[PDB]
Paper text:
The most widespread of these mechanisms employs a “controller” (C) protein encoded by a gene downstream of its own promoter, and usually co-transcribed with the endonuclease (R) gene as a single transcriptional unit. The C-protein binds at various sites within the C/R promoter to regulate transcription of its own gene and the associated endonuclease gene. Unusually, in the RM system [name], the C-protein also represses the MTase (M) gene by binding to the promoter at the transcriptional start site, denoted OM where the C/R genes and the M gene are transcribed convergently from different promoters. Flexibility in this loop is very important for DNA sequence recognition, as it has been observed in the nucleoprotein structures to adopt different conformations depending on which operator site the protein is bound to.
The [name] and Y37F mutants had KDs that were 11 and 3.5 fold higher than the wild type respectively. The three-fold difference between these two mutants indicates that both the phenyl ring and the hydroxyl group of the tyrosine are important for interacting with the DNA. SPR analysis showed that Y37F formed much more stable complexes with the OM operator site than [name], with KDs of 1.8 and 5.5 nM respectively, but both were less stable than the wild type (KD = 0.51 nM). This indicated that the role of the tyrosine was more than just the formation of a hydrogen bond with the DNA backbone, but also involved the phenyl ring common to both tyrosine and phenylalanine. The free protein structures of the wild type, Y37F and [name] mutants showed no major structural differences either in the local binding regions in terms of helix or side chain positions, or in the overall fold. The ΔΔG for the phenyl group alone (comparing the values for Y37F and [name]), is −2.8 kJ mol−1 (−1.4 kJ mol−1 per monomer). In terms of crystal packing interactions, the [name] crystal structure is identical to the triclinic wild type structure but adopts loop conformation I in both monomers in the asymmetric unit. The SO4 based interaction observed in the high-resolution wild type structure is also observed in the [name], S52A and monoclinic R46A structures.
Residue numbers in the entry:
A (entry chain A), B (entry chain B): 3 to 79
């Protein structure tokens, strides 16, 4: 699907712009590394609560995240 | 948790703007009515795939959804 693949793509794009490894995010987001890897490959089973934990771990506001998700969808869907 | 409470607010807001019942949304979204009620009652997490199916069931684009969520967070914190 287009949404979960865009959510993952935006998580990875921000994590690398902040210079972070999957381990680093895992530790800051309170989710296991395998979880992070999994979501970055497919975000279908990401919950909203976890996505919030990920945003806190990237240190990115929800609003910014959503604005990048919309920009990605609009420009590339 | 904060994100989920605004997501739950936006779902309910759109559902009622559209004049749809919870039963109607449940059927169109592939999610139990018990599920929908819990999501709106903040007593229940939600996956992105679930949120996707809800948007389809509301017949709103993800972009419009997320823009409404951003306005809600921004104007009302």
């Amino acid at each position: 699907s287009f949404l979960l693949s865009k959510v993952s793509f935006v998580i990875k794009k921000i994590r690398l712009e902040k210079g972070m490894t999957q381990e680093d995010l895992a530790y800051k987001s309170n989710l296991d590394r395998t979880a992070i890897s999994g979501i970055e490959r497919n975000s279908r089973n990401l919950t909203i609560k976890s996505l919030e934990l990920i945003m806190k771990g990237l240190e990115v506001s929800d609003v910014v995240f959503f604005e990048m998700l919309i920009k990605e969808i609009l420009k590339h869907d």
